[PDB]
């Protein structure tokens, strides 16, 4: 049993943890004089005792008591570390030299892709572009060397701890040499830093060290991106990013923010958090007129300075009674800090340069200063007041809200179901309204009156929707934790922090809870439930067993409650999402915009304001209190901070926490809305309020709610007086509507705040996304701060890390709009993980690296390469599908989606190999004196056939290759272990499923065996129609965790079998290229594949079929647009091809807009006739089980066995019998399912690699290719995605201007007809194995959907 610790911050820096450790170590309140400084020193944690008992720390402690060293705060040492400029002839020369190598290598790796792209477009370093870029990036600037050095030192302190803690448990790294001057005692339970020259000590947590490492990495990345980009832009102004930062200013920015966090302790983050505000103003000062920006600027300065004043107040109040009392600067008491602030902000405005690109990208600043040590008990105290406060409403205000909600529901019903909801109360309406009931129509907002909204509030509905009667296990199961039941809440605190009467009370309270109640995690909670049944959730919502339930608590850590109430919370949110959000699609003409933050907005809600609208959804679903569960239950439970180190003080002989007296971090009578819970109910009530305001103020509120930001838009037709301008009118309308918004929100318990609300004339910062004049200003750099060695993996998986580096790094291309800056940055951080950090793997010390070295020897001899260095340049270019190192296929630089990954991988390999073979990608494939591409393709098509489980595999990945011809993935590797741990689960729903899993994939493989043409996507649909699709979604989820074996073992340790499985997986995946590409004459093929008249898509066809032996596979194979289309820049006599034209008049169109409509590449729809019946009678998990079976009626109508097929497949799943079910099936008017089937496995849309706005610059004409593709294939469906041709041309327009600094006037794409083939719908011969089809349904019956019952079919009509 091994423990692998985090390499990045994934969690929170705990104020309570740092306070407890430091307070125990130094025998006095360290950070705050709370109860997590008292119990920490009376009864310390064993992990803290071990840290303090060390010989290194026992001497620092003694120095401190004798007064020789000054105890400080971790932000002080953050400032010290970050400005650590310690140099020698052996540290600033062995870091400059390593950086110079990384940069040269990344440019040399990028060179081959750049060569391929320039060769295709027709435009150790072969490309003169990267040859010029190399003479520029020869000497890293001192600012960049600074953060690279700091990141290397911090990171390889962290690596040295992680590997050594994997090797032996309890390891404490004691390091005083890596960083000169500093001395770390690092450990997963604490980090003690001592600086000798200054005589200072901080105690902090492992997460805070992770955060320091993250800060150094993030500033290294900001500097790297910036200085790659500035060199690019010194070469071509259109080759780098849109921003133009100067990095001496940026480093000064870093140091002044560090100084702010040094003066202000933890509190300083309050000030840093107002940075967003300041940047916002600088954007507004460019985009807005005087009154809007002046008002925002003044409110923003008030916000910043109240943040600073509150920061000083809290700092001096906190630090007064602690050991940090004399660590408060005199620049805080005497108010000189205002100058420091003035210099910080004044630097931001200088980094922005009054340029909207710099300003929008400057949002990375909000993330580059670390994270605060959030105080858990104080954040609860700030919320106790807002949630106990009594609210006073006019009964008329509640009636109008209820009525405006009921109006939305009546309107949505009439719009969807062509009907009014069935009224229990029709006698309540007047004649004017009761006449709207009978005509099934509604008045518009214009004809609506507030009396109408009062009268509507009396209507009561009959049930229109139905509860799902059997739990959806895919919605109740996840990786996160679960609050104990109330009586076991004390199990969330260490046994040492709890008094004896609580320890020996909770040793007896466990003897009366089920293993599921004591579980401590959701997955474990359900897997351990030996009395589980699918109808237990449903019986709770009907019997209302979640009311006055003595097991209820709320535990703040993010809030959580026991499983029985979390179930109801998720069900209530899900019913609103499925059934009710259809009615609320928002989830001079003086115009205006009002932006509000609804983060605290849940706090102000009460039962009187929530459950008047939520009571209308109770009636629609025929339930009592399901949607009102929160405000009816939480007022009776105790809200407690259950973070580990922040226990409550429990008075003697109090065991129940409803009897534990209130204190910091523990209170009662919380009225009003734990956040997240019921977030969807509060959104539609807010939209109803907006509709009521629009009525009261006579303006046309458009709305847009997304998370915690409500972006109202307001219009109000007026005609202005003389001397009043449009801007003045808009400002007046904004100020008036703001008054009304305030009054009406206050009418229901909600007091807005000038800080969190503001007004603009144009929709600013709508999605944390600066769109201005249709142009888009990205925050791309912010997305890429934490790109590094082992990101986003489990057990440091080498391939997933590569995948995440590559995926995150094309935010610099998709949004940043720099292909080459994304490329070079990708290659820096890829070369670093392959060539430098691979030998340091925490679990596989250099195994993976020795495998890479022998894979490179193989590559060297296969392609007869002159070096093992030039063999790594090749390994990191050829695709990851063939066991290579390239995570981003070259096609994704032009369009984001493809139906056929294998053709893209093969085209990528061809293009890359052209670098060494000097083939020309514009010219047809030809014979050349060197055969390296012939050898590559021959080893690809020629190989041993070893098909196994062909059909169950093509089902769960319709693009799988088979015959061990592609790299496996963690789900397949871990599946057979997941099912063997599940076979032992006490909950029989998973036990029996996992016990029958292997047999069910044996016969799920036999079902579609004998259907002579193979359609893997139809196979996908058959798969999803069956209860195994849902059985192994729970398996695919559990196989993504770490330590699958211990899931039921109650440890965070990774089992050694899991380590070995992951290690074998990684080593096989690394070495795949040796097997895929053998040297042995390419399998005794002394005659290599010929390239004259070769079509790569026929080759891909052959490789895929051969890989399974399958005589025919239809569907999947599709050409490559990159390969298929030959790029031209003039119209010759040929007069063929797609034509992409620039409609702008200016040569450079990056960061512009154009007349054209944006190109969303949407798939032509699935043309069908929807039959007439009562949709709402069926639950959504019944309605898409019909659309699946109807899709199978469509695809497989021609099989010899269809009547029996859909008879057994309709009775098994739906419960109807294929003639009662055929009535509900949509009837497809589309002949070709190959072209039109919509299924999980197929792209829904085909966008370009281009921000949407930019597509609006180009006009595409596909007319000349429909003339050629018609007179040859007539009007038959052919096999080349239509959307992706346009996507390719559009992206091609950008990429050419990136490398040329001119946008082409037009580009003509001329296809390779060879690559284009007919795609007509086959006739499916053979039967279905109908006894095997029933075997799947029977052995996986527990995951079957709800049966369309008999009291549910008669009322379908």
């Amino acid at each position: 049993n091994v423990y692998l610790t985090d390499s990045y911050l994934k969690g929170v820096i705990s104020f309570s943890e740092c306070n407890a450790l430091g307070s125990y170590i130094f025998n006095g309140p360290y950070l705050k004089n709370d109860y997590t400084n008292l119990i920490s020193r009376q009864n310390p944690l064993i992990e803290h005792m071990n840290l303090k008992k060390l010989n290194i720390t026992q001497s620092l402690i003694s120095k401190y008591h004798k007064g020789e060293i000054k105890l400080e705060e971790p932000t002080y040492f953050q400032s010290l570390l970050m400005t650590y400029k310690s140099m020698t002839s052996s540290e600033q020369i062995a870091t400059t030299n390593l950086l110079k190598k990384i940069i040269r290598r990344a440019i040399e790796i990028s060179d081959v892709k750049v060569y391929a792209i320039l060769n295709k477009l027709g435009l150790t370093i072969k490309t003169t572009l990267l040859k010029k870029l190399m003479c520029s990036m020869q000497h890293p600037p001192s600012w960049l060397i600074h953060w690279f050095n700091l990141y290397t030192k911090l990171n390889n302190i962290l690596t040295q701890y992680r590997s050594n803690e994997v090797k032996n448990h309890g390891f404490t790294l004691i390091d005083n040499q890596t960083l000169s001057g500093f001395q770390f005692i690092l450990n997963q339970y604490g980090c003690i830093v001592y600086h000798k020259e200054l005589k200072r000590i901080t105690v902090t947590t492992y997460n805070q060290f992770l955060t320091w490492k993250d800060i150094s990495l993030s500033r290294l990345n900001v500097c790297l991106i910036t200085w790659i980009s500035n060199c690019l832009n010194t070469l071509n102004k259109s080759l780098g990013l849109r921003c133009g930062f100067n990095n001496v200013i940026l480093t000064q920015l870093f140091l002044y923010g560090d100084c702010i966090l040094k003066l202000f302790h933890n509190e300083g983050f309050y000030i840093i958090k107002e940075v967003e505000g300041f940047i916002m103003s600088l954007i507004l000062n460019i985009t807005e007129e005087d009154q809007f920006r002046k008002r925002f600027y003044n409110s923003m300065l008030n916000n910043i300075t109240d943040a600073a004043n509150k920061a000083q107040k809290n700092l001096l109040s906190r630090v007064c009674h602690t050991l940090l009392d004399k660590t408060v600067s005199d620049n805080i008491i005497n108010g000189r800090w205002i100058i420091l602030l003035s210099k910080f902000l004044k630097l931001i405005k200088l980094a922005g340069d009054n340029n909207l690109n710099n300003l929008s990208e400057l949002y990375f600043l909000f993330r580059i200063f670390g994270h605060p040590m959030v105080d858990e008990r104080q954040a609860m105290d700030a919320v106790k007041i807002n949630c106990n406060e009594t609210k006073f409403y006019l009964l008329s205000s509640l009636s109008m809200l209820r009525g405006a909600f009921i109006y939305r529901i009546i309107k949505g019903f009439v719009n969807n179901y062509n009907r009014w909801p069935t009224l229990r109360n029709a006698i309540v309406l007047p004649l004017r309204w009761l006449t709207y009931y009978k005509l099934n129509t509604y008045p518009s907002l214009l004809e609506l009156t507030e009396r109408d909204l009062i009268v509507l509030s009396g209507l009561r509905f009959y049930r229109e929707f139905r509860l799902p009667k059997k739990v959806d296990l895919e919605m109740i199961i996840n990786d996160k934790a679960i609050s104990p039941p109330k009586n076991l809440i004390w199990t969330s605190f260490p046994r040492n922090y709890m008094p004896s009467h609580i320890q020996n009370y909770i040793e007896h309270e466990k003897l009366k809870f089920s293993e599921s109640d004591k579980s401590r995690r959701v997955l474990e909670y359900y897997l351990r439930d030996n009395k589980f049944n699918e109808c237990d959730l449903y019986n709770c919502v009907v019997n209302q067993s979640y009311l006055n339930n003595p097991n209820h608590v709320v535990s703040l850590t993010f809030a959580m409650q026991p499983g029985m109430f979390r179930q109801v919370q998720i069900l209530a949110e899900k019913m609103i999402a499925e059934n009710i959000l259809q009615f609320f699609p928002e989830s001079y003409i003086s115009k205006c915009s009002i932006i509000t933050d609804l983060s605290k907005f849940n706090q102000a809600f009460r039962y009187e304001t929530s459950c008047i609208c939520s009571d209308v959804l109770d009636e629609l679903h025929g339930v009592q209190s399901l949607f009102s569960w929160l405000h009816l239950t939480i007022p009776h439970v105790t809200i407690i901070c259950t973070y580990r180190h922040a226990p409550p003080y429990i008075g003697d002989h109090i065991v129940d926490l409803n009897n534990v007296d209130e204190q910091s971090g523990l209170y009662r009578y919380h009225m009003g809305g734990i956040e997240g819970w019921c977030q969807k109910l509060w959104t539609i009530e807010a939209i109803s309020l907006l509709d009521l305001i629009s009525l009261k103020g006579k303006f046309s509120i458009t709305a847009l709610i997304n998370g915690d930001n409500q972006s109202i838009d307001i219009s109000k037709p007026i005609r202005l007086m003389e001397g009043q301008t449009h801007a003045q009118a808009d400002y007046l309308l904004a100020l008036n509507s703001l008054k009304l918004l305030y009054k009406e929100y206050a009418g229901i318990g909600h007091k807005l705040k000038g800080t969190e609300t503001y007004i603009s004339r144009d929709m600013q910062f709508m999605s944390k996304t600066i769109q201005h004049n249709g142009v888009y200003y990205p925050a791309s750099i912010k997305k890429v701060l934490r790109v590094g060695p082992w990101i986003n993996t489990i057990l440091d998986d080498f391939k997933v890390s590569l995948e995440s580096i590559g995926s995150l790094t094309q935010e610099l291309e998709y949004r940043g709009e720099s292909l080459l800056c994304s490329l070079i940055f990708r290659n820096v951080w890829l070369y670093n993980q392959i060539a430098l950090q691979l030998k340091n793997h925490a679990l596989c010390n250099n195994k993976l690296y020795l495998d890479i070295l022998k894979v490179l020897k193989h590559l060297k001899t296969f392609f007869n390469l002159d070096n093992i260095d030039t063999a790594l340049t090749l390994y990191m270019n050829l695709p990851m599908l063939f066991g290579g190192g390239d995570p981003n296929l070259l096609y994704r630089s032009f369009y984001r989606r493809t139906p056929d990954f294998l053709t893209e991988a093969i085209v990528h390999s061809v293009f890359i190999l052209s670098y060494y073979t000097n083939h020309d990608l514009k010219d047809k494939l030809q014979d050349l004196s060197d055969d390296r591409l012939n050898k590559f393709l021959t080893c690809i098509i020629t190989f041993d056939k070893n098909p196994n489980a062909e059909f169950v595999t093509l089902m769960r990945d319709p693009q799988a290759l088979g015959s061990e011809r592609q790299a496996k993935i963690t789900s397949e590797i871990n599946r057979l272990a997941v099912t063997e741990v599940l076979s032992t689960a006490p909950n029989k729903i998973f036990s029996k499923s996992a016990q029958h899993y292997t047999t069910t994939e044996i016969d799920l493989n036999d079902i579609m065996q004998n259907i002579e043409p193979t359609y893997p996507h139809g196979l996908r649909v058959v798969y999803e129609s069956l209860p195994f699709y849902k059985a192994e979604k729970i398996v695919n989820l559990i196989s993504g965790t770490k330590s699958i074996t211990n899931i039921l073992e109650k440890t965070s340790a990774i089992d050694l079998t899991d380590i070995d499985r992951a290690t074998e997986m990684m080593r096989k995946n690394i070495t795949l290229l040796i097997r895929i590409l053998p040297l042995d004459c390419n399998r005794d093929k002394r005659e290599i594949l010929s390239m004259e008249n070769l079509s790569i898509t026929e080759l891909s066809k052959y490789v895929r079929e051969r890989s399974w032996s399958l005589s025919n596979i239809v569907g999947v194979t599709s050409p490559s647009i990159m390969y298929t289309m030959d790029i031209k820049y003039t119209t010759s006599t040929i007069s063929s091809g797609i034509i992409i034209e620039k409609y702008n008049v200016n040569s450079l169109t990056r960061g512009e807009r154009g007349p054209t409509k944006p190109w969303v590449g949407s798939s032509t729809q699935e043309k069908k006739t929807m039959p007439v019946y009562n949709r709402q009678v069926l639950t959504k998990k019944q309605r898409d089980q019909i659309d699946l079976l109807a899709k199978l009626d469509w695809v497989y109508a021609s099989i010899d066995n269809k009547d029996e097929f859909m008879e057994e497949l309709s009775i098994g799943t739906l419960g109807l019998t294929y003639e009662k079910a055929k009535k509900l099936f949509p009837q497809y008017l589309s002949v070709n399912y190959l072209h039109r089937l919509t299924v999980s496995s197929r792209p829904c849309e085909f966008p370009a690699s281009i921000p949407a706005y930019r597509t609006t610059n180009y006009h595409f004409d596909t007319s000349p290719i429909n003339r050629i593709l018609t007179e040859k294939y007539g009007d038959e469906d052919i096999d080349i995605v239509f959307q992706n041709c346009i996507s390719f041309g559009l992206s091609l327009m950008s990429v050419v201007e990136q490398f040329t600094n001119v946008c082409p006037n037009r580009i003509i794409l001329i296809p390779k007809l060879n690559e284009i083939h007919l795609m007509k719908p086959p006739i499916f011969t053979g039967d279905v194995d109908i006894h095997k089809l029933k075997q799947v349904i029977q052995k996986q019956h527990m995951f079957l959907p709800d049966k369309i019952s008999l009291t549910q079919y008669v009322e379908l009509f």
């Binding site: 009964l395 008329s396 509640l398 009636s399 209820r402 009525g403 309540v428 309406l429 007047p430 004649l431 004017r432 309204w433 009396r451 009062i454 009268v455 509507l456 509030s457 009396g458 009561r460 009959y462 049930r463 509860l467 919502v541 009907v542 019997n543 009311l547 006055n548 039962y607 009187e608 459950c611 008047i612 009571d615 109770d618 009636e619 679903h621 025929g622 339930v623 009592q624 209190s625 405000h631 009816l632 239950t633 007022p635 009776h636 009225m671």
Partner: protein
Amino acid sequence: NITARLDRIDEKLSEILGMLHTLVVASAGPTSARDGIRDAMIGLREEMIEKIRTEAL
């Protein structure tokens, strides 16, 4: 006139109904659920009557 004044009486007596209903819905809250009174105030509905039948069989 007569048969038009009852229109006003109807339109106002409907507004009274809306008022008094929203007041019942809001007045049956955390302390009614606690005392087992909310269902008597908002009235039994489909999924609970269905259960009472299934018990009747």
